Every structure is written in C-alpha cells, then in structure tokens.
Amino acid sequence: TIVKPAGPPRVGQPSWNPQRASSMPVNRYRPFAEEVEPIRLRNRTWPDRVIDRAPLWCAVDLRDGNQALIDPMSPARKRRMFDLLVRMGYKEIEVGFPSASQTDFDFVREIIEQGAIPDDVTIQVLTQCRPELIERTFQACSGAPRAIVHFYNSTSILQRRVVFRANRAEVQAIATDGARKCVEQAAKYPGTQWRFEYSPESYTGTELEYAKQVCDAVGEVIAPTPERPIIFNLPATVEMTTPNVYADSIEWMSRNLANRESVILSLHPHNDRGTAVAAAELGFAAGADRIEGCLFGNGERTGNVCLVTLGLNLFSRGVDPQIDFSNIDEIRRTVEYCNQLPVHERHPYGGDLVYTAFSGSHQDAINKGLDAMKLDADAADCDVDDMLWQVPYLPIDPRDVGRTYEAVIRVNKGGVAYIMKTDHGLSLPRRLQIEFSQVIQKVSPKEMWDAFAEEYLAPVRPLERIRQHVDAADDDGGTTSITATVKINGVETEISGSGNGPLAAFVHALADVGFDVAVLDYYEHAMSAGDDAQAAAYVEASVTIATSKTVWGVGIAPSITTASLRAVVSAVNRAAR
C-alpha cells in the first residue's frame, strides 16, 4: 500500500513547502553525469535555434514498433502499415530485421518482388554485426534498386562491462568488422545502390568521445562522401535524462565527428522519461539531419518518439512537415489495426478528446475566436478556412486534420449519445452529436430532448412534406421517380424528380424549388426489433437555399423509405435555423 512520506524536510527547505522525505530508495540511482559522464557545452547554440525545415524522416514502425507488440504484425498488417507510410510521404522506411525473423525476410521479399516500393523510397533493414546475419541481410534485399543497411552494436559503459565483459577496442571491432562485411557484401551486389547506417546502440549510456571514436572508425571503413553519405544514428535506447543534455550531446557530435559533410546525423529517441518529442526537437535544433520514430509513439516499453507529434508540431508553427496528416483519423485507424493498441484519448493531435472543450468559458472564447475569424474573412472577401488561425485553446484548426471542434455538454450514467439512445431510441451519428451539442451550448434530459425536437423534428418552415408518390423501378439498377406534395413557407406546391433511389429523387425534386441538398452521408437503424419497427434515418448535407451550410437531418417513420425523406426535410429546415 501507499504510505505518506514522513521524513524530515531537506536542510534549507523553505517554510512554505511542507513536503516530507519519502522512503523511496533514491540511493540506488545516480545523477546522469555520474551514471555516464558530465556533458559540458557552455557554448551550445541549439537553444538559440528555431527549426525551419522538416528533418529527413525515417519510419521504424515495421521493425522497432513491430518488435514491441503483444501481437506482432501479420503479413497483411505489415503491408498496410507499409502502404500508409508510403502514402503519407515517408522516404526512408525500416521494414524489418530479416536476418533475425523469417517473417521479416518474407516481407522484404514480397515488397521487392511485387514492386510495392516507389522509386523515391529507400527501404532500410536492421542487422546485428555477425557476418552471416549481414550476408542474409543482403540476400533479403536482393533486387532492391536501393537499400539502407542499418547495422548496430551496444556501446554503453554498462553493457561493455557486464554484457560483453569487453574493452573499448573489442566493442569497436564488433562495429568495424560489421562495417567491413558490409563493404564486401555491397560489392557482391552491384545491382543495388547500397547505403549504410550505423547505431552505437545505448548511445545515451556511452561516453561521447567513445561514440565519436567508434563512428569515425566505422566511417573510415565505409568511406562515405557528400554524395554517398553515411547515417550515424544516435539512439536514446533508454531515455536517461532531460532533453537538453541529449541536445548538448548531439551538438557535440555534430561538431566533432570526422568527415561531417559525409554524415547524415540521425536521432532515435525513446520515451522512458516522457520527453522523447523534446529530445528529437532539441536535438534537431542541435544539428541533426534526420529522425527515426513511429506513428503515435509505438515501440519498446514507453515507445519511440511520435512522428505524428513531431510533424504537426512543425505544421502548427508554420513549417511544412512534408508529410500528409490531413486525415488524422485514417492514420489512427490504420495504426490501431496494425499495432492492435489504441492511441490514447489525450494523445497529441490524434486522441479522441483533443479537439474537445468542456469548459463553458473555453467554449465561449472558442466561439468568439471563430466569429472574429469569420468577420475578418468577409471583410477581406476570403475563405475563412484559408486565413490565419486565431482561436483560443485550439492550437490548430481541427478541420486541417479532418477533425471537428466539439463543445461537450453535460446532461444533468449520462451524456448526449447515451440518453438519446436509452430514453429515445436514437443512435446519433458522431457528427450529429457534435453539431447538436453546439446547439445546446447556446442541461437536463428533458431540456436536451425538447431542444432536439425543436431543431430536428418539429420545424415545418420553410419546408414541409405532406405526402408523396414514390414510383420505384421494379428492376434493379432502375430509376426511381417521385412526386411530392410540399408546403414552401406554407404554400402548397408540387415537386418532381428522379434518381437511382428515392432519396436521390426527392433531392432532385427539391432542387427545382430552390433547395440544393448536397448529400454527404446517410444512416438508418430500427428503433426496436420486429419487421414493423420504426426506422430512424439521419442525413448529412451541405444545403443551399434561394451561402451553403453543412447540417444534419433526422427523420423517424414506420417505413424505411419515408424515414429517409423526413430526414431530408429535417436537414433542409435545420439549414434555415
């Protein structure tokens, strides 16, 4: 159980701080400077640098993220993850560890053999330095027009001591021999353009002078040039300290590595201390050229730096990430499919709750910011969606990620969706729950229902539907025509249209009378069991009356066909409120 800290306060601890020494065994842990080495960089320049271009991005989802899963990816999930990364615009993709995993081997064969790799994409494969594992890495890759062989070995103070029980020259030689084997294998395969990446694995627990020594030594072997450079990848395999010390280390490495013009400086931060995004951002500022990571932070334990957070962290401060995130829910769905692990509710940019507001004053402020943007657009004759986003509490326009701002209204166990289904038998499409909470925002169960009926069910002006005649074609693929008796602002009129179904027909019938309903989406469900249940239909439409608003329509009827036509009328009249 948890017991209240009860030791004396520190010596010199101020009077206004009543905290107590805990009995946590801090003696078992040391400051990073004593665990590893003091990193002094008093002339650092990274704190004075604001990032202004995308890094070279490398997605490791298919290796590092895969390694990390309760259920590793099936051949299908591998392939889906691969096509998402390509389609988002990543150019370096680490596709597996084929010398260590027959399923990685099969996967790399597949993508080579079936032409899944675009000509601007370089596949990357991980290997350890054992020469036969390196041989089989090249074999995996046979037929690739180009590939990065990523080789590595652990170089930490603690691993050299207790894992390898090895000296500095011995641990360096693992890597130089690895490098040598890479050079000889590349020459045995002139059909692939080969590139190299070397990681001093557990870099963050390694002396920087030794990290430099091993990398320089590896570079001497590979012999890279400005046109044919090497990636030195510097991982925080364990994130051991604050991101500034990581940054200081990258700046030192950037200035001190031999042959710096023939180096792509790559970062690979983990998240043990919760600051993996900060390490990537600070370390990029420090002179790195490239960042390895995963969509939504997937990877071993606390994960790899999140490539979504890093990309939109650029977008939202005016830098093009060079990666498409304009449908973040498609990315999220694909990612959760592949990894079979949910993105958290509060995950930056992509979590369920991140475009929500629960505070009444946040809501009021957001509405004023939105209004003031809309006034400025009319003045400038511009589309508000093209202008400087200026809205309190929302770092970005959610529309720019295919998401919607949502004010969440508490209903006096609860919530709109929930009381609507339970007490009224309506399962409201999510974007209908959004739009209607916006209405309540301008509450008890009864108040919400009354408001709901006011917006969606009761209105009869400008459009009312009295009756209609549906002529459905008997033959599949045939035309449906409709004549309907409608009142337009109380005036009885006769409307007619045709379409591939009854909703299409009724939509074309209304166009002739000055209501343009451009239908975006449609849902329907029974309100009970039995062939004679009521049908509730929901229609999303961008509607124009003789400017255009997106609104929802709701209709309820004994007939599935009719419930759908009611929804349309509902929609039309909602657009006029």
d(CA 108, CA 379): 56
Residue type, 370: L
CB of 514 to a second copy, least distance (A): 16
Among 176, 199, 564, 573, binds a second copy (CB under 8 A): 564
Is 344 annotated in some ligand binding site? no
Q: How many residues bind a second copy (CB under 8 A)?
A: 207
Min. distance of Cβ 554 from a second copy in angstroms? 14
Q: Least distance to Zn ion from the beta carbon of 534, Å?
A: 45
Rounded to whole angstroms, the Cα distance separating 172 from 412 reads 67
The binder of 326, among ligand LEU, a second copy, Zn ion, none, by C-beta within 5 to 8 A per type, is a second copy
Contact 247, 46 (CB under 8 A): yes
Residue 381 interacting partner from Zn ion, a second copy, ligand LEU, none (CB closer than 5 to 8 Å by kind)? none
What is the contact mask toward a second copy in residues 270 to 289, using x (rule: CB under 8 A)?
Answer: -xxxxx-xx--xx--x---x
Q: Which stretch binds ligand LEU (CB under 6 A): 261-269, 355-363, 368-376, 494-502?
A: 494-502
Q: Which of 307, 313, 155 is nearest to 234 (CA)?
A: 155
Find tokens 């400087």 and name the residue. Answer: 388
Contact string 385-414 vs a second copy (x = CB under 8 A) = xxxxxx-xxxxxx--x-------x-x--xx
Pairing mode, strands 406-407 and 356-357: parallel
268 in a known ligand binding site: yes
Which residue is at the shortest CB distance from Zn ion?
64
Pair of tokens at residue 179: 């490098």
Residue 522 Cβ vs ligand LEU, minimum distance, rounded to whole Å: 4
Interface with ligand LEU (CB under 6 A), residue from 119, 132, 386, 531: 531
The listed partner (ligand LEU, Zn ion, a second copy, none) that binds 486, CB under 5 to 8 Å by sort, is none
269 binds a second copy (CB under 8 A): no
Binding of a second copy at residue 521 (CB under 8 A)? yes
Determine the interface stretch with ligand LEU among 158-166, 209-217, 354-362, 501-509 (rule: CB under 6 A). Answer: 501-509
For residue 334, give the H/E element and its range: helix 328-339
State how beta strands 263-269 and 491-499 pair: unpaired
Distances (CA, A) of 237 to 208, 233, 475: 15, 11, 65
Task: Calculate the dihedral angle through the C-alpha atoms of 456, 457, 462, 463, rounding to the nearest 10 degrees.
Answer: 110
Contact letters (x/-) for Zn ion, 273-312, by CB under 5 A?
----------------------------------------
Site for ligand LEU contains 71 (CB under 6 A): no
Residue 58 pairs in a beta bridge with 92, 292
Angle between helices 416-424 and 430-441 in degrees, nearest 10: 100
Told to check if 526 binds ligand LEU by CB under 6 A, we report yes
Q: Could you tell me which of 267, 264, 269, 276 has the C-alpha nearest to residue 222?
A: 264
The reply to whether 347 sits in an annotated binding site is no
Query: Number of H helices and number of E strands within the chain?
Result: 17, 16
Q: How many CB atoms lie within 10 A of CB 334?
A: 19
Q: In 3D, which of 26, 34, 29, 33 has the Cα closest to residue 10?
A: 26
Which entry of a second copy, ligand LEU, Zn ion, none binds 437, CB below 5 to 8 A by partner kind? Answer: none
* Residues in contact with a second copy, shown as a per-residue x/- string from 127 to 166 under the rule CB under 8 A: -x-------------------------x-x-xx-xxx---
**Sheet containing strand 463-471, strands side by side:** 463-471, 480-488, 491-499
Count of residues touching ligand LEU (by CB under 6 A): 17
Q: Is 304 annotated as a binding residue?
A: yes
Alpha-carbon distance of 447 to 439, in angstroms, equals 12
Query: Which of 131, 392, 425, 501 is the binder for ligand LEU (CB under 6 A)?
Result: 501
- Picking from 47, 114, 115, 55, the residue whose alpha carbon sits closest to that of residue 90 is 55
Q: Which stretch binds a second copy (CB under 8 A): 105-113, 166-174, 182-190, 339-347?
A: 339-347
CB 537 within 8 Å of CB 523: yes
Please report which residue ranges of 260-359 form alpha helices under DSSP H: 276-285, 307-315, 328-339
533 contributes a contact to ligand LEU by CB under 6 A: yes
Site for Zn ion in 61-90 (CB under 5 A): 64
Distance of closest approach, residue 29 Cβ to a second copy, in angstroms? 4
- Member of 132, 442, 474, 546 binding a second copy (CB under 8 A): 474
Q: Which two tokens stand for residue 512?
A: 């002739």
Please report, as ranges, the residues that interact with Zn ion according to CB under 5 A.
64
Please report, as ranges, the residues that interact with ligand LEU according to CB under 6 A.
499-504, 519, 522, 526, 531-535, 558-560
Q: Which residues are annotated as a binding site for Mg(2+)?
A: 64, 268, 270, 304
